[PDB]
Design a protein around this ligand. Sequence first.
Ligand SMILES: Cc1onc(-c2ccc(O)cc2O)c1-c1ccccc1
Length: 207
Amino acid sequence: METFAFQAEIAQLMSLIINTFYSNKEIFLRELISNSSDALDKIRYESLTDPSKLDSGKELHINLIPNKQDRTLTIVDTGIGMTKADLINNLGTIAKSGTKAFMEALQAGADISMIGQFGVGFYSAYLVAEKVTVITKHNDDEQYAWESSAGGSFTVRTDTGEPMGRGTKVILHLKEDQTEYLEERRIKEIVKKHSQFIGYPITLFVE
Ligand SMILES: Cc1onc(-c2ccc(O)cc2O)c1-c1ccccc1
């Protein structure tokens, strides 16, 4: 396992998300499903000129898996996936510049729900999760596990777990007061409200 320090700007973003009083936490799901949709578009685009890109899996979907016993909400997609370099470089984002633009917008009157307009929507996971684990597999690299409970650092390791073919799995270890996001009715409500125009099947698993 390798441990890395977040860039100062990203540690500042995470602290703002964790510490700011902001009741509209539900937007984390829209942000994560939006990232999944973007990753699925990328592999579909590459497959148009190279059909062998889909040898690691032809299905393009998003699965939402709540687990009440482990207190986790997992979002699985079969998108392009991230390489080790992508994971280290802020999960494939330009997060340093995105954070700068987002923080300026917040000072001017914008609110936390607009985070996605700054290309740093992933970090909204910290509105509801005490720890986030990202398992990812890109065609050109091995399967990795990224993890962070914030606190200024993240870890990366080769994942020896269940092989995923291709794509990304985001495991949200929920905060104790955020268990409403494991309830079927609550998840359905959020998906219908914010993700009605996502062009891939979104399957809400049951227990
Ligand atoms: C590329 C890529 O490959 N997997 C993800 C991914 C990142 C986060 C996530 O929640 C789900 C995902 O599929 C992304 C990605 C990187 C930056 C912006 C949007 C997608």
